[PDB]
């Protein structure tokens, strides 16, 4: 669950850092 909250758009899970994931709204979370 290592995922600091950082408002950023994402195209896929890899676009985000740490174990964060890309939700449907198109942002990491």
Curated annotation (Swiss-Prot):
Primary localization: secreted
Entry-linked Gene3D superfamilies: 4.10.75.20
SMART domains: PTI
Secreted keyword on record: yes
The protein, known as: Trypsin inhibitor 1
InterPro entries the UniProt entry points to: Prot_inh_squash, Proteinase_amylase_inhib_sf
GO cellular component term of the entry, any: extracellular region
Disulfide bond annotation, renumbered to this chain: 3-20, 10-22, 16-28
A Pfam family hit: Squash
Family, similarity comment: Belongs to the protease inhibitor I7 (squash-type serine protease inhibitor) family.
Species: Cucurbita maxima (Pumpkin)
Molecular function as annotated in GO: serine-type endopeptidase inhibitor activity
């Amino acid at each position: 669950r290592v995922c600091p909250r950082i408002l950023m758009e994402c195209k896929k899970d890899s676009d985000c850092l740490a174990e964060c994931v890309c939700l449907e709204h198109g942002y990491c979370g």
